């Protein structure tokens, strides 16, 4: 399983695992391949912000892989 290589990747890995109910998730994990849907996307957006990273639901649907999602995130102001 692929370790995160940036702070944003590491935060999103942890949030993916928490939202999807998994123990740990790799930096190459696909949110919808792992069981994501509209409800869980909503939760991912909220919990990512709590972890310091601003994303949208549209970001998740367009970039469901952790590493790709981390690249469009913005740090919370």
Residue numbers in the entry: 3521 to 3597
Quote the original article.
Non-ribosomal peptide synthetases are important enzymes for the assembly of complex peptide natural products. Within these multi-modular assembly lines, condensation domains perform the central function of chain assembly, typically by forming a peptide bond between two peptidyl carrier protein (PCP)-bound substrates.
Given that the PCP2 and PCP3 domains of the fuscachelin NRPS are highly similar (65% sequence identity), and that PCP domains can act as both aminoacyl donors and acceptors for C domains, we rationalized that the arrangement observed in our structure is a valid model of an acceptor-PCP-bound C domain. Importantly, the residues at the interface with the C domain are conserved or highly similar. Furthermore, computational docking of the PCP3 domain onto the acceptor-PCP binding site of the C3 domain showed that it binds in an almost identical orientation to the PCP2 domain in the structure of the PCP2-C3 didomain.
